[PDB]
Design a protein around this ligand. Structure first.
Ligand SMILES: Cc1[nH][nH]c(=O)c1CCO
Ligand SMILES: [Cl-]
Ligand SMILES: [Cl-]
Length: 163
């Protein structure tokens, strides 16, 4: 584990992370996809061998020795708010199990079911609070990656507010 487990946020491409493993915002079919998934596909295409996995689950595939944790959040266009909320919490619980299993000291994580799977709604708080619920009991350093300047501020505020 990390000597003093922390949460941090950075505004940049998760493909350039400085962590021991990465969480992909995957689709269920292990396709290259869009947004974070497409960036992950360019950087670690070898990790898409047999990466298909159901909604609400995570599946780790190594790129060399670098673990890519494919986490499938729900697409809120298809799920009800209630069922989507349940599957989004579940995906993050499965990420925490894999991060623990791998024994990493740090993980790079995007906010699942924001962007294309958000169903046109702002889900920063929903997604971040499910991330915290799952990762709080882990001792890895967690680095959250985002692209929007206002989201960076709001994620930073949410981290600092619980300190
Ligand atoms: C600005 C931003 N970053 N990620 C997102 O999902 C959005 C739109 C929210 O409605
Ligand atoms: Cl960048
Ligand atoms: Cl963002």
């Amino acid at each position: 584990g990390a000597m003093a487990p922390s949460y941090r946020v950075k505004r940049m491409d998760i493909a350039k992370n400085d962590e021991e493993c990465v969480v992909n915002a995957a689709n269920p079919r292990g396709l290259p996809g869009d947004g974070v998934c497409k960036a992950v596909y360019k950087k670690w295409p070898e990790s898409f061998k047999n990466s298909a996995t159901p909604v609400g689950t995570a599946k780790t595939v190594m790129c060399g020795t670098y673990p890519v944790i494919h986490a499938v959040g729900p697409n809120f266009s298809n799920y009800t708010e209630s069922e989507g909320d349940r599957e989004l919490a579940a995906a993050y619980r499965e990420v925490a199990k894999e991060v623990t299993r791998l024994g990493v000291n740090s993980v790079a994580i995007p906010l699942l079911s924001t962007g294309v799977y958000s169903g046109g709604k702002d889900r920063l708080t929903q997604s971040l609070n499910h991330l915290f619920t799952a990762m709080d009991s882990t001792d890895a350093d967690v680095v959250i990656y985002c692209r929007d300047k206002e989201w960076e501020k709001k994620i930073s505020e949410a981290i600092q507010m619980r300190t």
